[PDB]
Amino acid sequence: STGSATTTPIDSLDDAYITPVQIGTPAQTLNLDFDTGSSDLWVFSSETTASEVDGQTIYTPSKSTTAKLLSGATWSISYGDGSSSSGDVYTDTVSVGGLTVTGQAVESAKKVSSSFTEDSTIDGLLGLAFSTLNTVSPTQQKTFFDNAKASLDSPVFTADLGYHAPGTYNFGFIDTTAYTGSITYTAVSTKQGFWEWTSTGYAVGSGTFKSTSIDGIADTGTTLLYLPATVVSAYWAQVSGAKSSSSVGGYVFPCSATLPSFTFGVGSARIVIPGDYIDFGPISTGSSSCFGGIQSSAGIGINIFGDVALKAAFVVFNGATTPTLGFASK
Numbered sequence: 001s002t003g004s005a006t007t008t009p010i011d012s013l014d015d016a017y018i019t020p021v022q023i024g025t026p027a028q029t030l031n032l033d034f035d036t037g038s039s040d041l042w043v044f045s046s047e048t049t050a051s052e053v054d055g056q057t058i059y060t061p062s063k064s065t066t067a068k069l070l071s072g073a074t075w076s077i078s079y080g081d082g083s084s085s086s087g088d089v090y091t092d093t094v095s096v097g098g099l100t101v102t103g104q105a106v107e108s109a110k111k112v113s114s115s116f117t118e119d120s121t122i123d124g125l126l127g128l129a130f131s132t133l134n135t136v137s138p139t140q141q142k143t144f145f146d147n148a149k150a151s152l153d154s155p156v157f158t159a160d161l162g163y164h165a166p167g168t169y170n171f172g173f174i175d176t177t178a179y180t181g182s183i184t185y186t187a188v189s190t191k192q193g194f195w196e197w198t199s200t201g202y203a204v205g206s207g208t209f210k211s212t213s214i215d216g217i218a219d220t221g222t223t224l225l226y227l228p229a230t231v232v233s234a235y236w237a238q239v240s241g242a243k244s245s246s247s248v249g250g251y252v253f254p255c256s257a258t259l260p261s262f263t264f265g266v267g268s269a270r271i272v273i274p275g276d277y278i279d280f281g282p283i284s285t286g287s288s289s290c291f292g293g294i295q296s297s298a299g300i301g302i303n304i305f306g307d308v309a310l311k312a313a314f315v316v317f318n319g320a321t322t323p324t325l326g327f328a329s330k
């Protein structure tokens with residue numbers, strides 16, 4: 001089997017991407033944030049505290065003839081921004097782009113934090129990291145990909161995120177028309193539950209490539225590119241007037257600037273992020289200070305190749321017995 005679904009930016013800045021997902025019978029279609037940095041499939045639901053729902057589409061398990069309460073199961077998750085959600089669990093039929101999994105754990109939110117309520121465009125998360133991170137207790141549950149894997153033509157999924165445009169998540173096949181040149185594969189450590197790999201270095205603009213190992217995660221659920229402070233300083237030093245602002249929460253730059261590209265290494269290959277991809281716009285409406293798309297990972301404890309980096313590439317998440325990651329230009 002295979003699946004193929006279009007993923008669409010939620011706003012003009014590509015802050016996140018939503019992908020339609022069919023849950024239950026008859027189908028209830030919710031727009032989920034596919035997140036290769038986490039491992040829970042959770043949704044706004046008929047059980048979510050009413051005051052915490054503001055425009056999201058909800059899953060109503062009582063209206064699905066295939067929903068079954070997973071008795072005694074609960075979940076609770078916190079993410080990097082201090083956002084969180086929690087609830088109970090149903091199993092139900094879940095389809096993505098024509099690929100169907102029966103008995104998928106669908107984590108129904110009873111509570112969500114304010115940042116979720118305030119974002120009407122995201123109806124929940126679909127985790128695509130390793131199932132060892134799944135938060136369901138007392139019986140940990142498998143991700144959609146983990147459940148689908150054995151049925152897939154090939155045990156892979158791919159992320160092809162667009163810059164200011166829709167893109168594609170494919171399951172079970174590699175679309176050889178979707179990238180240029182060859183795909184370079186690189187080793188993954190699953191020890192922290194992430195698609196964790198080691199970049200071979202970086203360049204800023206037309207500058208020379210610096211060979212240096214940068215361990216980090218391929219994370220479709222994080223907007224920006226978070227790298228060591230040394231690397232980030234070297235980038236922003238090439239932008240007149242850029243500075244790190246503790247009051248804003250990172251590097252900002254004059255909106256009048258033209259940003260340089262940023263290149264990262266994948267083995268001997270190179271992925272170039274155009275400068276425009278690094279512009280996240282005015283810090284507040286009408287400001288001439290713009291927020292940077294490359295930020296320091298100091299304090300996070302891990303480097304994160306988020307959407308800013310991934311959208312410059314065609315990315316293969318290879319879930320073979322020994323997982324690997326592939327990157328191609330496009």
Ligand SMILES: O[C@H]1[C@H](NCc2ccco2)[C@H]2CO[C@H](O2)[C@@H]1N1CCCCC1
Pocket residue numbers: 016033035037038079080081082083125221222223226300304
């Ligand atoms: O891990 C990500 C999260 N990803 C999943 C998620 C939840 C809601 C949408 O996506 C979201 C919510 O908190 C932040 O962004 C967090 N943060 C991003 C900056 C670098 C450190 C980690």
Ligand SMILES: O[C@H]1[C@H](NCc2ccco2)[C@H]2CO[C@H](O2)[C@@H]1N1CCCCC1
Pocket residue numbers: 013015248249250280281282283284291
């Ligand atoms: O909230 C984000 C904004 N998000 C997109 C956006 C624009 C308007 C609404 O949402 C953009 C523009 O400025 C920054 O990045 C701002 N900043 C991030 C670091 C600390 C928290 C505040």
